[PDB]
Amino acid sequence: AVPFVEDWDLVQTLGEGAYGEVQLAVNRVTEEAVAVKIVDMKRCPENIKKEICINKMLNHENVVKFYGHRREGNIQYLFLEYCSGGELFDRIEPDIGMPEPDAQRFFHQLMAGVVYLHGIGITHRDIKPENLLLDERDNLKISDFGLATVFRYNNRERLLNKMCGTLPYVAPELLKRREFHAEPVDVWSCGIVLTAMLAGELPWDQPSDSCQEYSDWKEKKTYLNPWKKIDSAPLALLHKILVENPSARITIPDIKKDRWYNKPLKKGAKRP
Numbered sequence: 001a002v003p004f005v006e007d008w009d010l011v012q013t014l015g016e017g018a019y020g021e022v023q024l025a026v027n028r029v030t031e032e033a034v035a036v037k038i039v040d041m042k043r044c045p046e047n048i049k050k051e052i053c054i055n056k057m058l059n060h061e062n063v064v065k066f067y068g069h070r071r072e073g074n075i076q077y078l079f080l081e082y083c084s085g086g087e088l089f090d091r092i093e094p095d096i097g098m099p100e101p102d103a104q105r106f107f108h109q110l111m112a113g114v115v116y117l118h119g120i121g122i123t124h125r126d127i128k129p130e131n132l133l134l135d136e137r138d139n140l141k142i143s144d145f146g147l148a149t150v151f152r153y154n155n156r157e158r159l160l161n162k163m164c165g166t167l168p169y170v171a172p173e174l175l176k177r178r179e180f181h182a183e184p185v186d187v188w189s190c191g192i193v194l195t196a197m198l199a200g201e202l203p204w205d206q207p208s209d210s211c212q213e214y215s216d217w218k219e220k221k222t223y224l225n226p227w228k229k230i231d232s233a234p235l236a237l238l239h240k241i242l243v244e245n246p247s248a249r250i251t252i253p254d255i256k257k258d259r260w261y262n263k264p265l266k267k268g269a270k271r272p
């Protein structure tokens with residue numbers, strides 16, 4: 001049955017995940033390219049088990065596909081969809097961002113991915129441009145479920161309490177409340193991601209009053225960067241997403257109803 005078809009050559013290092021190193025693997029026979037996350041369990045053999053477990057639950061066009069996994073001694077292997085376009089992080093130009101239409105399309109795809117995840121009761125907990133990958137047609141794919149967890153099971157929501165994520169992207173309730181709903185936390189990070197795509201800079205080191213840029217936002221001083229670089233329509237959406245009270249924060253079903261979210265901006269990919 002086609003010899004050598006299970007042999008892959010590691011041709012280059014693509015990056016680093018929350019729990020491992022990622023290599024580009026090319027099939028010896030088909031030349032099919034996949035990404036292989038390699039994790040030396042000599043650190044934590046369980047954290048990686050959970051990630052593999054969450055990946056097995058997923059199947060969506062906006063989520064990095066999980067092909068399988070193999071354990072070789074004290075080395076865990078995760079075969080994942082290769083996204084030749086790289087990290088969204090690298091499409092954001094420092095202090096400028098990117099064309100609004102591109103940002104809107106990536107945001108539409110990010111939302112699609114998050115709606116899907118939240119739909120099966122999984123929260124990512126570390127949404128940031130570094131973890132949002134682009135395939136060859138610039139389709140966005142959510143990656144790295146190393147910090148992901150189940151927040152709804154048997155139709156019962158479980159409140160979270162683990163401080164998790166990346167400070168610039170984390171919701172303020174993680175810093176001031178002991179327990180919190182999972183979903184608004186992911187919405188918030190998507191909000192910070194939109195700000196980065198549209199302004200090329202993160203608004204604050206963290207969402208605490210001790211942080212001046214953050215109090216400035218709560219005061220509505222949008223005449224300052226990064227907000228002044230953002231057009232009124234998407235800024236209006238950001239005023240709904242970046243709300244301190246998680247209960248008053250806009251939900252995804254409503255983001256989908258937002259004026260900017262539905263504004264025709266981007267033409268489809270050019271055709272011959």
Ligand SMILES: NC1=NC(=O)/C(=C2\CCNC(=O)c3[nH]c(Cl)c(Cl)c32)N1
Binds near residue numbers: 081083145
């Ligand atoms: N953060 C992260 N988790 C992953 O599984 C992951 C992958 C694996 C998913 N596919 C990729 O093409 C990829 N490119 C780069 Cl750069 C990284 Cl790193 C990856 N990146």
